[PDB]
């Protein structure tokens, strides 16, 4: 018999992104080649099958630094990290291949789906 | 020029609630009289003006235990904590006064608003 506040989940995510911008309570650095990205492990796990697996691991759960595969593109990661915290995906002709490869590695199925659909439409 | 995934914020919040149920990466215990509630500081701050103030404080940000005012009702807190993690508010005739008082203390303005409207309709 609950009532539901429609905008609550969006409001929570907006405040999680504000915490990220101010670097408040971030507990991990994701290293992608020469670039570093600070984030909250809980948000990464909530958005990515890869981070969900990493941070449920009894040893990796305690690491403050995670190094991604050297084939991962930093811009593609940056775009996906912004998506995680905002629901908005900056998908462009110039970045779609990197975004799709990064989303496959991160196991972000909905992003992979749409990248596939956008690529199919251009061929 | 971003695209947006409509269900993303709800999906994130669902996974944050799953982490809470499994006690994964919870970093605080909220003590309300004889009861204890484990939570994620980032979610508490994102939902509550009181926790936002507490966890931005340079000393309180590092505490693993937060004790609420002894006038706070544990059930009212439990209902609001569930709301934080789900967008669903279990508002009943038997708990509305406790929920509203707890929401005022926690500075959860949208919950206070609706409690006020539900009370006004019954008088």
């Amino acid at each position: 018999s609950c009532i539901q506040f429609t905008r609550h989940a969006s409001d929570v995510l907006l405040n999680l992104n504000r915490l990220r911008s101010r670097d408040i309570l971030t507990d991990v650095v994701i290293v992608v080649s020469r670039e570093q990205f600070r984030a909250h492990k809980t948000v990464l796990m909530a958005c990515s099958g890869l981070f969900y697996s990493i941070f449920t691991d009894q040893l990796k759960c305690n690491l403050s630094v995670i190094n991604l595969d050297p084939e991962i593109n930093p811009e593609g990661f940056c775009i996906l990290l912004d998506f995680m915290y905002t629901s908005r995906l900056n998908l462009r002709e110039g970045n779609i291949m990197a975004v799709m490869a990064t989303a496959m590695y991160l196991q972000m199925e909905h992003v992979v789906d749409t990248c596939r659909k956008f690529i199919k439409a251009s061929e | 020029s971003c695209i947006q995934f409509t269900r993303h914020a709800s999906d994130v919040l669902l996974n944050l609630n799953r982490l809470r149920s499994r006690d994964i990466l919870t970093d605080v215990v909220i003590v309300v009289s004889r009861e204890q509630f484990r939570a994620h500081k980032t979610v508490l701050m994102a939902c509550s003006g009181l926790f936002y103030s507490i966890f931005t404080d340079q000393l309180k940000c590092n505490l693993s235990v937060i004790n609420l005012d002894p006038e706070i009702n544990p059930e009212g807190f439990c209902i609001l904590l569930d709301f934080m993690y789900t967008s669903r508010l279990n508002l009943r005739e038997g708990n509305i006064m406790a929920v509203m008082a707890t929401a005022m203390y926690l500075q959860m303005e949208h919950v206070v608003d609706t409690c006020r409207k539900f009370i006004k309709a019954s008088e």
């Binding site: 609950c2 009532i3 539901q4 506040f5 429609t6 | 669903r88 508010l89 949208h110 609706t114």
Partner: peptide, 4 residues
Amino acid sequence: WVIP
């Protein structure tokens, strides 16, 4: 607020 809505009835979900």
